[PDB]
Design a protein around this ligand. Structure first.
Ligand SMILES: Nc1ncnc2c1ncn2[C@@H]1O[C@H](COP(=O)(O)OP(=O)(O)OC[C@H]2O[C@@H](O)[C@H](O)[C@@H]2O)[C@@H](O)[C@H]1O
Ligand SMILES: Nc1ncnc2c1ncn2[C@@H]1O[C@H](COP(=O)(O)OP(=O)(O)OC[C@H]2O[C@@H](O)[C@H](O)[C@@H]2O)[C@@H](O)[C@H]1O
Ligand SMILES: [Mg+2]
Ligand SMILES: [Mg+2]
Ligand SMILES: [Mg+2]
Lengths: 305, 431, 21, 48
């Protein structure tokens, strides 16, 4: 019955949308993002609330009065935080701060525009109702790298699990320390380093807890030798403000045989509590735009979603 | 004819120390109102006498912030006082949860689940933890243990009922009075005004968990799961939750059970919520051909038709909780009553026990209780191939000892064939 | 089991090297 | 039994059991009695 079903889906493979006849209107929603009112880890500080039909910069919106708030941790000036006065800094090109290269380029086609009064950058992806840097240490684009390590979801007999006529994937997910919601491992790019090292380093630190196995590590290197950058998109991250926003580069490490994935001893470390292998489907509730990232990896691998 | 001092077991687990009842029971709190957090002393503990029942049942009204271990010592202190120091320790904790009112089922299916539960309970001397109220599957389980209680010579296995305080018609009666109440009449038929849910008369103990509210349910779910985990660690016994029918709180109960490491057995075809959980598990894990058409949309439709969440955010949270229950394939075992055989429910319970976290020897002892020679043989062969020789040799002697006590000759041949020296067997107590 | 394995490999089929981490 | 519809089965189980008694089918009486058919709710075809 399994072979008959498999051959049946192996033989089966002017666009018009007639959904207006059923409902009686169109979709009329681009799925515009508005962050929640209470800023995380700020001790109850709330933004200035705006509706989802007023966010774009093409639209006028004369009643826009955002609040300027910067977190005490960011304001104490660590090594990974940019200076409080954003003057003389050049955006949209690779800029050298203390001899270390920082990307600073956004994937938005229009680019980043510089405010004349204060020199702070303005977010091209819409309004978020809040100025200042907030919890983010760098002005403008915070480049994040996400590591999606995937394997085919297999039964004990060795057969790959199949749902809706497509093969089912499985990815490593970590439970975040701050808000206890599951997410893809990843993090902000450190000074003087690129996305490859950052992605790999965050995966060992968070999912595996390495640092803070020789040949098996070499096996992991074999796992890390075949990665494809699937997307570079803007995050719908709740910590985003008008002067600091997260943009992610997603790196997919797929294990076709499943040998390298089976040698991982999952144990939560750094800013992660627990890590586990989790099935990909459309009803997943993950942090920021990780559902979009999982959609891109299943779209690229022709997997179920 | 009332106890003044009690034997409370020490935290070391080596002996029991004698201490005053008011001294031990001072650590339990009550809430006078919803606003209150620190609370006031409870003073509502004792025994209730029910009509047509010879034995009396102890009751304790405790708070949500109270330690479940303390409640476990309290239960140990009653049993140690009543049956002596050498009372029969549980090798299985059987939690029966589900529908309080919506439990409607055909008699043959009910008879089959009841028969399997009765056999499992009588063979393993299990402690069955259900709800404290006089409705549905809890009342049915109470009837099963009522029939069970007119046998097994002296010892009767406890039927602990953990219920939220505030819904009980005799709540005013247990509040009014002095702290000790030995013989108190419980009137289930009395017309009490702001409450309508009575206690089951066949339950042997009662824990009424209070957080300050009237006519609100589900406040005792987390404490019940924590209490089962505490009991499981203390007596080294696996805890198995069974889901028959059930509402939204049964889903939350299953979520608590899977978060605390307790395995669950979902009886498919026995109800709505069970069908939703079984459907979710079969979609995520089952490799059979008939489950390949399962989708998130049909699951969402099932959640909407079953729970009736009204809003999309409620539906998203219920769907997320249902998908969170069946994330770990080891912790959920689905028994299909309407498809598989009549006598395979104990095999499903045993599969949940073996998939849980526990020592191999205790699981083999548990397998020996259910009389499943093939499961033990397969487990022994798998254990033999995977090395781990020190733990097998460390537990083979007590497993052999348990086999001698419980009259299982096939099991003695099995255990003796796997390098168990006959002269290294050790007694349980100290001479 | 051989046919299932054979069909499984018959259905399965910006280069970045992250081994430096 | 799997497809629900409990009211119609309970409504017709009594006459089916009655027909089984008249036509001498003991295996069928065991079958019909096992599927929640109360023995004391059987009804005659005619009116007395
Ligand atoms: N530019 C920065 N902004 C904020 N915090 C930073 C920065 N650089 C370093 N940090 C430090 O890194 C710590 C958290 O480690 P990360 O792994 O970098 O943080 P995490 O939230 O896990 O990564 C960002 C996650 O958000 C998503 O938008 C994105 O996909 C990524 O997964 C923070 O406590 C902070 O001290
Ligand atoms: N423990 C209870 N006892 C009696 N009635 C209850 C209980 N819990 C809820 N009710 C009320 O009775 C109705 C029937 O409940 P169901 O929807 O059938 O099941 P559910 O609401 O999930 O109750 C499950 C509860 O039972 C216990 O097994 C378990 O502890 C769980 O809390 C519900 O609408 C509810 O208002
Ligand atoms: Mg991270
Ligand atoms: Mg980090
Ligand atoms: Mg990190």
């Amino acid at each position: 019955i399994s072979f008959r079903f498999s051959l049946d889906q192996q033989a089966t493979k002017n666009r018009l949308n007639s959904a207006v006849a059923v409902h009686g209107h169109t979709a009329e929603a681009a799925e515009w993002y508005v962050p929640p009112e209470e800023y995380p880890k700020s001790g109850g500080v709330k933004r200035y609330l705006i509706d989802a039909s007023m966010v774009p910069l093409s639209i006028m919106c004369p009643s826009y009065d955002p609040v300027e708030y910067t977190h005490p941790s960011v304001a104490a000036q660590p090594v990974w935080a940019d200076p409080a006065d954003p003057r003389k800094i050049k955006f949209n090109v690779k800029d050298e701060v203390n001899g270390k290269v920082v990307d600073r380029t956004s994937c938005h086609p229009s680019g980043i525009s510089i405010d004349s009064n204060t020199g702070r950058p303005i977010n091209p992806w819409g309004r978020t109702g809040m100025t200042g840097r907030g919890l983010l240490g760098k002005w403008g684009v915070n480049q994040a790298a996400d590591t999606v390590v995937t394997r085919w979801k297999r039964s004990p007999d060795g057969s790959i699990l199949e749902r809706d006529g497509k093969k089912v994937l499985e990815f490593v997910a970590i439970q975040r320390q701050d808000n206890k919601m599951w997410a893809i491992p990843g993090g902000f790019v450190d000074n003087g380093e690129d996305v490859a090292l950052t992605s790999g380093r965050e995966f060992m630190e968070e999912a595996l807890g390495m640092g803070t196995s020789a040949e098996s590590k070499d096996s992991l290197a074999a796992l890390f030798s075949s990665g494809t950058i699937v997307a570079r998109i803007y995050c719908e991250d709740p910590r985003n403000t008008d002067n600091a926003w997260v943009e992610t580069t997603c790196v997919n490490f797929h294990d076709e045989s499943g040998r390298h994935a089976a040698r991982l001893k999952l144990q939560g470390g750094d800013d992660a509590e627990h890590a586990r292998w989790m099935m990909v489907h459309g009803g997943l509730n993950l942090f920021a735009s990780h559902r979009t990232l999982l959609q891109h990896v299943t779209s690229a691998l022709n997997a179920y979603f | 004819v009332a106890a003044k001092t009690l034997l409370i077991e020490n935290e070391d687990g080596k002996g029991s120390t004698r201490m005053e009842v008011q001294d031990f029971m001072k650590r339990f709190h009550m809430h006078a109102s919803e606003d209150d957090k620190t609370g006031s002393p409870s003073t509502a503990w004792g025994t209730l006498r029910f009509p047509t029942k010879e034995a009396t049942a102890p009751y304790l009204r405790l708070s949500v912030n109270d330690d479940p271990e303390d409640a476990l010592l309290f239960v140990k202190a009653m049993l140690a006082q009543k049956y002596g120091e050498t009372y029969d320790r549980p090798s299985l904790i059987l939690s029966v949860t589900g529908g309080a009112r919506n439990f409607t089922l055909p008699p043959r299916l009910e008879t089959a689940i009841a028969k399997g539960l009765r056999l499992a309970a009588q063979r393993t001397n299990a402690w069955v933890v259900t709800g404290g109220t006089n409705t549905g599957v809890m009342k049915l389980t109470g009837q099963i243990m009522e029939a069970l209680s007119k046998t097994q010579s002296h010892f009767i296995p406890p039927t602990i009922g953990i219920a939220t305080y505030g819904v009980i018609i005799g709540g005013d009666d247990m509040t009014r009075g002095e702290p000790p109440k030995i013989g108190l009449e419980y009137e289930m038929h009395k017309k009490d005004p702001p409450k309508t849910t009575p206690l089951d008369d066949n339950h042997n103990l009662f824990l009424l968990v209070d957080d300050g509210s009237t006519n609100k349910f589900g406040k005792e779910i987390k404490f019940r799961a924590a209490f089962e985990n505490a009991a499981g660690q203390a007596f080294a016994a696996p805890v198995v939750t069974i889901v028959v029918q059930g509402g939204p709180g049964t889903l939350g109960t299953a979520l608590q059970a899977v978060r605390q490491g307790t395995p669950i057995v979902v009886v498919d075809g026995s109800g709505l919520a069970a069908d939703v959980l079984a459907y979710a598990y079969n979609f995520m894990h089952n490799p059979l051909t008939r489950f390949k058409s399962y989708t998130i949309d049909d699951l969402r439709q099932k959640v909407a038709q079953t729970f009736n969440p009204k809003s999309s955010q409620q539906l998203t949270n219920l769907l997320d909780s249902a998908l969170e229950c069946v994330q770990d394939p080891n912790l959920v075992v689905v028994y299909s009553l309407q498809e598989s055989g009549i006598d395979e429910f104990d095999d499903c319970i045993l599969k949940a026990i073996f998939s849980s976290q526990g020592k191999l020897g205790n699981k083999l002892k548990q397998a020996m209780y259910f009389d499943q020679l093939d499961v033990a043989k397969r487990a022994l062969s798998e254990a033999s191939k995977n090395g781990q020789h020190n733990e097998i040799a460390a537990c083979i002697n007590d497993n052999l000892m348990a086999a001698m006590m419980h009259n299982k000759p096939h099991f003695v041949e099995l255990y003796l064939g796997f390098d168990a020296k006959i002269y290294e067997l050790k007694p349980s107590e100290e001479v």
